[PDB]
From a paper:
The NpnN, Ap4A, Ap5A and Gp4G levels within cells are primarily maintained by Nudix hydrolase superfamily member Ap4A hydrolase (Ap4AH from hereon). Based on sequence analysis the P. falciparum Ap4AH (PfAp4AH, EC 3.6.1.17) was predicted to be an animal-archeal type which cleaves polyphosphate chain at the fourth phosphate from the tightly bound adenosine resulting in asymmetrical cleavage of Ap4A. PfAp4AH can asymmetrically hydrolase Ap4A and Ap5A molecules produced by PfKRS (and probably by other Pf aaRSs) to ATP + AMP and ATP + ADP, respectively. PfAp4AH folds into a conventional Nudix domain, with four β-strands (β1, β2, β4 and β5) sandwiched inside two anti-parallel helices (α1 and α3).
We also provide two crystal structures of PfAp4AH - in apo and sulphate-bound forms at atomic resolution. There are four molecules in asymmetric unit for PfAp4AH-apo and designated as A, B, C and D. The atomic resolution structure of PfAp4AH-SO4 has three SO4 ions and a PEG molecule which arise from crystallization buffer. Of the three SO4 ions bound in PfAp4AH-SO4, one engages the P1 site (located between loops L2 and L5). We were able to directly compare the active site residues involved in engaging sulphates (or P1 by analogy). Active site-bound SO4 is coordinated by analogous residues (Pf/Hu) His43/His32, Lys48/Lys42 and Tyr87/Tyr82, but unlike PfLys94 analogous HsLys89 does not engage sulphate. Global structural differences between apo- and SO4- bound PfAp4AH were apparent upon superimposition. Three major variable regions arising from SO4 binding and different space group packing of PfAp4AH were identified in loop regions L2, L3 and L5 and analyzed further. In case of PfAp4AH-SO4, His51 forms a hydrogen bond with one of the water molecule in a nearby water network linked to Ser56. In particular, side chain flip in Tyr87 and His43 suggests substrate-induced conformational adjustment similar to the human counterpart.
Author numbering: 4 to 21, 28 to 149
Write the structure that this text describes.
């Protein structure tokens, strides 16, 4: 009954400019002002992490050899048309900031955003808070 999705919260260390991380957000092709990390539904015989890795590869062209999976995950439960949804994000750090992002038909744009940009990108509280808490983890 719950729609379950899995994604990689992909981050990178922000380049110097005269909350030090950025997160890869993708703009949905089929929605209005809808930006999320790479994510999607299970396929067969997948752990949540396997699903997250595959969906990230499908949606960005970035495979798991390009990032370091970190010891942080969070499950967000929220409503979509009053239908319960749960999305689990696994934090990973992209080792080369400048990896070429290759979008699929699912998205029209991407942006590496800081946690402070959450309101600008109209993120729901669950996602905004995910970014802040991930940055807290990254600063341990």
């Amino acid at each position: 009954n719950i729609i379950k999705a899995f994604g990689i919260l992909l981050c990178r260390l922000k380049k110097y400019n005269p909350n030090k991380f950025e997160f890869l957000f993708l703009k949905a092709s089929y929605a209005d002002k809808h930006w999320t990390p790479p994510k999607g539904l299970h396929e067969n015989n997948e752990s949540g992490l396997e699903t997250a890795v595959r969906e990230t590869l499908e949606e960005t062209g970035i495979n798991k050899d390009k990032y370091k999976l970190l010891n942080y995950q969070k499950t967000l439960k929220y409503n979509v048309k009053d239908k319960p949804k749960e999305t689990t994000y696994y934090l990973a750090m992209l080792l080369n900031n400048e990896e070429n992002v290759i979008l699929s038909d699912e998205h029209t744009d991407y942006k590496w955003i800081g946690s402070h940009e959450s309101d600008t990108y109209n993120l729901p509280e669950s996602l905004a808070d995910l970014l802040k808490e991930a940055e807290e983890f990254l600063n341990k």
